[PDB]
Design a protein around this ligand. Structure first.
Ligand SMILES: CCCCCCCCOC[C@H](COP(=O)(O)OCCN)OP(=O)(O)CCCCCCC
Ligand SMILES: CCCCCCCCOC[C@H](COP(=O)(O)OCCN)OP(=O)(O)CCCCCCC
Ligand SMILES: [Ca+2]
Ligand SMILES: [Ca+2]
Lengths: 134, 134
Protein backbone atom coordinates (compact mmCIF):
# COMPACT_ATOMS: atom_id res chain seq x y z
CA UNK A 1 0.00 0.00 0.00
CA UNK A 2 1.21 3.49 -0.89
CA UNK A 3 -0.42 6.57 0.61
CA UNK A 4 -2.07 8.54 -2.25
CA UNK A 5 -0.35 11.85 -2.86
CA UNK A 6 3.04 10.21 -2.33
CA UNK A 7 5.11 7.82 -4.41
CA UNK A 8 7.30 6.38 -1.62
CA UNK A 9 5.15 6.26 1.58
CA UNK A 10 4.16 2.60 2.03
CA UNK A 11 5.47 -0.81 0.90
CA UNK A 12 8.22 -0.08 -1.60
CA UNK A 13 7.49 2.78 -3.98
CA UNK A 14 5.53 3.45 -7.17
CA UNK A 15 7.89 6.10 -8.50
CA UNK A 16 8.89 5.96 -12.19
CA UNK A 17 12.40 7.30 -11.48
CA UNK A 18 14.72 7.61 -8.43
CA UNK A 19 14.02 11.35 -8.21
CA UNK A 20 10.23 11.50 -8.61
CA UNK A 21 8.15 12.93 -5.75
CA UNK A 22 4.38 13.07 -5.30
CA UNK A 23 1.85 15.84 -4.69
CA UNK A 24 2.83 16.01 -0.99
CA UNK A 25 6.47 16.71 -1.93
CA UNK A 26 7.71 17.33 1.66
CA UNK A 27 6.14 14.22 3.19
CA UNK A 28 7.11 12.09 0.22
CA UNK A 29 10.71 13.35 0.39
CA UNK A 30 10.93 12.09 3.96
CA UNK A 31 9.73 8.60 2.79
CA UNK A 32 12.01 8.57 -0.24
CA UNK A 33 15.08 9.04 1.97
CA UNK A 34 13.67 6.49 4.42
CA UNK A 35 13.35 3.92 1.61
CA UNK A 36 16.95 4.70 0.55
CA UNK A 37 18.31 3.76 3.99
CA UNK A 38 21.76 2.07 3.58
CA UNK A 39 20.83 -0.74 6.01
CA UNK A 40 17.43 -2.47 5.84
CA UNK A 41 16.13 -6.03 6.04
CA UNK A 42 13.22 -7.13 3.91
CA UNK A 43 10.29 -9.08 5.24
CA UNK A 44 11.48 -12.49 6.43
CA UNK A 45 15.15 -11.60 5.78
CA UNK A 46 17.99 -12.52 8.16
CA UNK A 47 20.74 -10.02 8.98
CA UNK A 48 23.26 -9.26 11.74
CA UNK A 49 22.12 -12.44 13.49
CA UNK A 50 18.57 -11.07 13.58
CA UNK A 51 15.60 -11.96 11.41
CA UNK A 52 12.68 -9.76 10.45
CA UNK A 53 9.48 -11.73 11.02
CA UNK A 54 7.27 -8.80 9.99
CA UNK A 55 5.47 -8.67 6.66
CA UNK A 56 7.09 -5.27 6.07
CA UNK A 57 10.61 -3.90 5.85
CA UNK A 58 12.43 -3.03 9.03
CA UNK A 59 15.42 -0.69 9.01
CA UNK A 60 18.27 0.48 11.17
CA UNK A 61 17.35 2.80 14.04
CA UNK A 62 19.43 5.64 12.55
CA UNK A 63 17.18 5.74 9.50
CA UNK A 64 14.01 5.50 11.58
CA UNK A 65 15.13 8.42 13.77
CA UNK A 66 15.99 10.59 10.77
CA UNK A 67 12.57 9.72 9.33
CA UNK A 68 10.93 10.86 12.59
CA UNK A 69 12.67 14.26 12.49
CA UNK A 70 11.98 14.64 8.78
CA UNK A 71 8.24 14.15 9.30
CA UNK A 72 8.11 16.48 12.31
CA UNK A 73 9.79 19.15 10.16
CA UNK A 74 7.69 18.57 7.02
CA UNK A 75 5.72 21.51 5.58
CA UNK A 76 2.99 19.04 4.52
CA UNK A 77 1.85 18.75 8.12
CA UNK A 78 -1.53 16.96 7.60
CA UNK A 79 -0.11 14.07 5.52
CA UNK A 80 3.08 13.92 7.64
CA UNK A 81 0.97 13.74 10.79
CA UNK A 82 -0.95 10.79 9.32
CA UNK A 83 2.15 8.96 8.06
CA UNK A 84 3.97 9.74 11.33
CA UNK A 85 1.21 8.44 13.63
CA UNK A 86 0.70 5.32 11.49
CA UNK A 87 4.37 4.29 11.25
CA UNK A 88 5.59 5.13 14.76
CA UNK A 89 2.43 4.52 16.77
CA UNK A 90 0.03 2.08 15.06
CA UNK A 91 1.94 -0.61 13.03
CA UNK A 92 4.10 -1.65 16.00
CA UNK A 93 7.38 -1.95 14.09
CA UNK A 94 10.97 -2.05 15.39
CA UNK A 95 14.42 -0.93 14.32
CA UNK A 96 17.84 -2.53 14.79
CA UNK A 97 21.14 -1.05 15.89
CA UNK A 98 24.49 -2.03 17.39
CA UNK A 99 24.22 -1.58 21.18
CA UNK A 100 25.50 -3.10 24.43
CA UNK A 101 23.41 -6.07 25.54
CA UNK A 102 20.14 -4.78 26.96
CA UNK A 103 19.21 -5.70 30.51
CA UNK A 104 16.20 -3.59 31.51
CA UNK A 105 13.83 -0.71 30.90
CA UNK A 106 11.85 2.20 32.44
CA UNK A 107 8.88 2.55 30.03
CA UNK A 108 9.89 6.11 29.03
CA UNK A 109 6.37 6.18 27.57
CA UNK A 110 4.33 3.12 28.40
CA UNK A 111 3.64 0.49 25.82
CA UNK A 112 7.30 0.94 24.81
CA UNK A 113 10.75 1.09 26.38
CA UNK A 114 12.84 4.16 25.43
CA UNK A 115 15.36 4.15 28.33
CA UNK A 116 16.48 0.56 28.51
CA UNK A 117 19.46 -0.53 30.54
CA UNK A 118 22.54 -2.05 28.93
CA UNK A 119 25.57 -3.97 30.21
CA UNK A 120 28.43 -1.67 29.24
CA UNK A 121 31.09 -4.30 29.93
CA UNK A 122 30.05 -6.49 27.00
CA UNK A 123 30.79 -5.66 23.38
CA UNK A 124 27.97 -4.22 21.29
CA UNK A 125 25.61 -6.53 19.43
CA UNK A 126 22.71 -5.91 17.01
CA UNK A 127 19.34 -5.97 18.76
CA UNK A 128 15.75 -4.85 18.10
CA UNK A 129 14.39 -1.66 19.70
CA UNK A 130 11.11 0.23 20.13
CA UNK A 131 10.50 3.55 18.39
CA UNK A 132 9.50 6.83 20.05
CA UNK A 133 5.81 7.76 19.87
CA UNK A 134 5.05 10.42 17.23
CA UNK B 1 -6.21 7.93 13.19
CA UNK B 2 -8.54 9.41 10.57
CA UNK B 3 -7.59 9.41 6.90
CA UNK B 4 -7.20 13.06 5.78
CA UNK B 5 -9.89 14.09 3.33
CA UNK B 6 -12.48 12.16 5.33
CA UNK B 7 -14.15 12.76 8.67
CA UNK B 8 -15.21 9.16 9.44
CA UNK B 9 -12.52 6.83 7.97
CA UNK B 10 -10.44 5.64 10.95
CA UNK B 11 -10.92 5.29 14.73
CA UNK B 12 -14.20 7.00 15.51
CA UNK B 13 -14.84 10.21 13.59
CA UNK B 14 -13.84 13.88 13.72
CA UNK B 15 -17.09 15.19 12.26
CA UNK B 16 -18.73 18.22 13.90
CA UNK B 17 -22.26 16.95 13.14
CA UNK B 18 -23.89 13.59 12.25
CA UNK B 19 -24.28 14.68 8.62
CA UNK B 20 -20.86 16.18 7.85
CA UNK B 21 -18.74 14.59 5.10
CA UNK B 22 -15.16 15.31 4.04
CA UNK B 23 -13.47 16.28 0.79
CA UNK B 24 -13.69 12.68 -0.48
CA UNK B 25 -17.48 12.69 -0.04
CA UNK B 26 -18.09 9.24 -1.64
CA UNK B 27 -15.41 7.39 0.33
CA UNK B 28 -16.31 9.20 3.54
CA UNK B 29 -20.01 8.37 3.06
CA UNK B 30 -19.12 4.69 2.98
CA UNK B 31 -17.23 5.08 6.34
CA UNK B 32 -19.98 7.18 7.91
CA UNK B 33 -22.53 4.41 7.32
CA UNK B 34 -19.97 1.84 8.48
CA UNK B 35 -19.51 3.75 11.76
CA UNK B 36 -23.32 3.91 12.17
CA UNK B 37 -23.62 0.11 12.07
CA UNK B 38 -26.44 -1.01 14.46
CA UNK B 39 -24.26 -3.77 15.98
CA UNK B 40 -20.61 -3.15 16.92
CA UNK B 41 -18.33 -3.99 19.83
CA UNK B 42 -15.73 -1.53 20.99
CA UNK B 43 -12.15 -2.46 21.71
CA UNK B 44 -12.04 -4.88 24.64
CA UNK B 45 -15.87 -5.09 24.80
CA UNK B 46 -17.77 -8.35 25.38
CA UNK B 47 -20.90 -9.17 23.36
CA UNK B 48 -22.92 -12.18 22.20
CA UNK B 49 -20.57 -14.38 24.25
CA UNK B 50 -17.62 -13.04 22.24
CA UNK B 51 -15.03 -10.46 23.22
CA UNK B 52 -13.13 -8.10 20.97
CA UNK B 53 -9.45 -8.27 21.90
CA UNK B 54 -8.44 -5.84 19.14
CA UNK B 55 -7.47 -2.25 19.84
CA UNK B 56 -10.09 -1.18 17.29
CA UNK B 57 -13.82 -1.60 16.84
CA UNK B 58 -15.13 -4.77 15.28
CA UNK B 59 -18.60 -4.94 13.75
CA UNK B 60 -21.17 -7.39 12.50
CA UNK B 61 -20.40 -9.07 9.18
CA UNK B 62 -23.46 -7.48 7.54
CA UNK B 63 -22.00 -4.02 8.07
CA UNK B 64 -18.55 -5.07 6.91
CA UNK B 65 -19.99 -6.54 3.69
CA UNK B 66 -22.04 -3.42 2.96
CA UNK B 67 -18.88 -1.38 3.56
CA UNK B 68 -17.00 -3.54 1.04
CA UNK B 69 -19.64 -2.97 -1.67
CA UNK B 70 -19.85 0.73 -0.84
CA UNK B 71 -16.11 1.20 -1.34
CA UNK B 72 -16.05 -0.84 -4.57
CA UNK B 73 -18.83 1.42 -5.89
CA UNK B 74 -17.34 4.72 -4.68
CA UNK B 75 -16.63 7.45 -7.25
CA UNK B 76 -13.58 8.49 -5.17
CA UNK B 77 -11.70 5.45 -6.43
CA UNK B 78 -8.12 6.38 -5.29
CA UNK B 79 -9.05 7.03 -1.62
CA UNK B 80 -11.55 4.13 -1.59
CA UNK B 81 -8.88 1.81 -2.98
CA UNK B 82 -6.54 2.85 -0.16
CA UNK B 83 -9.17 2.57 2.59
CA UNK B 84 -10.43 -0.71 1.09
CA UNK B 85 -7.00 -2.39 0.89
CA UNK B 86 -6.06 -1.20 4.40
CA UNK B 87 -9.24 -2.34 6.17
CA UNK B 88 -9.92 -5.66 4.40
CA UNK B 89 -6.37 -6.75 3.60
CA UNK B 90 -3.77 -5.21 5.95
CA UNK B 91 -5.20 -4.69 9.51
CA UNK B 92 -6.32 -8.33 9.84
CA UNK B 93 -9.69 -7.62 11.46
CA UNK B 94 -12.75 -9.87 11.83
CA UNK B 95 -16.52 -9.56 11.89
CA UNK B 96 -19.16 -11.45 13.87
CA UNK B 97 -22.45 -12.97 12.80
CA UNK B 98 -25.00 -15.59 13.84
CA UNK B 99 -24.10 -18.83 12.03
CA UNK B 100 -24.20 -22.61 12.52
CA UNK B 101 -21.16 -23.89 14.42
CA UNK B 102 -18.18 -23.86 12.07
CA UNK B 103 -16.32 -27.10 11.46
CA UNK B 104 -13.92 -26.53 8.56
CA UNK B 105 -12.65 -24.45 5.67
CA UNK B 106 -11.32 -24.43 2.06
CA UNK B 107 -9.14 -21.28 1.99
CA UNK B 108 -11.31 -19.62 -0.69
CA UNK B 109 -8.34 -17.26 -0.95
CA UNK B 110 -5.38 -18.31 1.12
CA UNK B 111 -4.50 -16.53 4.30
CA UNK B 112 -8.26 -16.53 4.99
CA UNK B 113 -11.21 -18.91 5.00
CA UNK B 114 -14.25 -17.76 2.97
CA UNK B 115 -16.01 -21.14 2.46
CA UNK B 116 -15.98 -22.66 5.90
CA UNK B 117 -18.05 -25.70 6.77
CA UNK B 118 -20.82 -25.56 9.36
CA UNK B 119 -22.83 -28.16 11.28
CA UNK B 120 -26.38 -27.43 10.11
CA UNK B 121 -27.96 -29.60 12.81
CA UNK B 122 -26.95 -27.25 15.63
CA UNK B 123 -28.62 -23.93 16.31
CA UNK B 124 -26.83 -20.78 15.17
CA UNK B 125 -24.33 -19.08 17.45
CA UNK B 126 -22.29 -15.86 17.16
CA UNK B 127 -18.77 -16.50 15.91
CA UNK B 128 -15.86 -14.54 14.39
CA UNK B 129 -15.18 -14.68 10.63
CA UNK B 130 -12.57 -13.57 8.09
CA UNK B 131 -13.32 -10.84 5.55
CA UNK B 132 -12.99 -11.11 1.77
CA UNK B 133 -9.84 -9.61 0.24
CA UNK B 134 -10.43 -6.20 -1.41
C1 LIG C 1 -1.89 -1.54 8.32
C2 LIG C 1 -0.50 -2.11 8.00
C3 LIG C 1 0.22 -1.39 6.88
C4 LIG C 1 1.63 -0.97 7.16
C5 LIG C 1 2.52 -0.61 6.02
C6 LIG C 1 4.00 -0.89 6.25
C7 LIG C 1 4.97 0.10 5.66
C8 LIG C 1 6.44 -0.29 5.73
O1 LIG C 1 7.25 0.80 6.26
C9 LIG C 1 8.59 0.60 5.73
C10 LIG C 1 8.90 1.65 4.70
C11 LIG C 1 10.34 1.60 4.22
O2 LIG C 1 10.55 0.31 3.61
P1 LIG C 1 10.31 0.08 2.00
O3 LIG C 1 9.33 1.02 1.47
O4 LIG C 1 9.96 -1.37 1.86
O5 LIG C 1 11.80 0.35 1.79
C12 LIG C 1 12.53 0.57 0.62
C13 LIG C 1 13.66 -0.46 0.55
N1 LIG C 1 13.59 -1.00 -0.86
O6 LIG C 1 8.54 2.92 5.19
P2 LIG C 1 7.93 4.18 4.40
O7 LIG C 1 8.91 5.28 4.61
O8 LIG C 1 7.70 3.83 2.99
C14 LIG C 1 6.58 4.00 5.57
C15 LIG C 1 5.25 4.51 5.45
C16 LIG C 1 4.08 3.99 6.24
C17 LIG C 1 2.91 4.92 6.10
C18 LIG C 1 1.51 4.54 6.13
C19 LIG C 1 0.64 4.98 4.96
C20 LIG C 1 0.00 3.76 4.28
C1 LIG D 1 -2.30 0.44 11.25
C2 LIG D 1 -3.50 0.17 12.17
C3 LIG D 1 -4.62 1.18 12.06
C4 LIG D 1 -6.00 0.65 11.87
C5 LIG D 1 -7.17 1.53 12.12
C6 LIG D 1 -8.42 0.82 12.60
C7 LIG D 1 -9.74 1.36 12.10
C8 LIG D 1 -10.99 0.76 12.73
O1 LIG D 1 -11.95 0.36 11.71
C9 LIG D 1 -13.25 0.40 12.36
C10 LIG D 1 -14.06 1.56 11.83
C11 LIG D 1 -15.49 1.57 12.34
O2 LIG D 1 -15.44 1.69 13.78
P1 LIG D 1 -15.47 3.15 14.51
O3 LIG D 1 -14.94 4.20 13.64
O4 LIG D 1 -14.76 2.96 15.81
O5 LIG D 1 -16.99 2.99 14.64
C12 LIG D 1 -17.98 3.91 15.01
C13 LIG D 1 -18.75 3.36 16.20
N1 LIG D 1 -18.81 4.50 17.18
O6 LIG D 1 -13.99 1.59 10.42
P2 LIG D 1 -13.94 2.84 9.43
O7 LIG D 1 -15.13 2.69 8.55
O8 LIG D 1 -13.91 4.10 10.20
C14 LIG D 1 -12.39 2.12 8.90
C15 LIG D 1 -11.32 2.76 8.21
C16 LIG D 1 -9.91 2.22 8.17
C17 LIG D 1 -9.12 2.96 7.13
C18 LIG D 1 -7.69 3.23 7.18
C19 LIG D 1 -7.24 4.67 7.02
C20 LIG D 1 -6.43 5.12 8.24
CA1 LIG E 1 8.34 3.02 0.94
CA1 LIG F 1 -14.70 5.54 11.80
Amino acid sequence: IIYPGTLWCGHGNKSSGPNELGRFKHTDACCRTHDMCPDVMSAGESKHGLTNTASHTRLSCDCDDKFYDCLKNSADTISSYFVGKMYFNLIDTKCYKLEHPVTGCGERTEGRCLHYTVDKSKPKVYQWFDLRKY
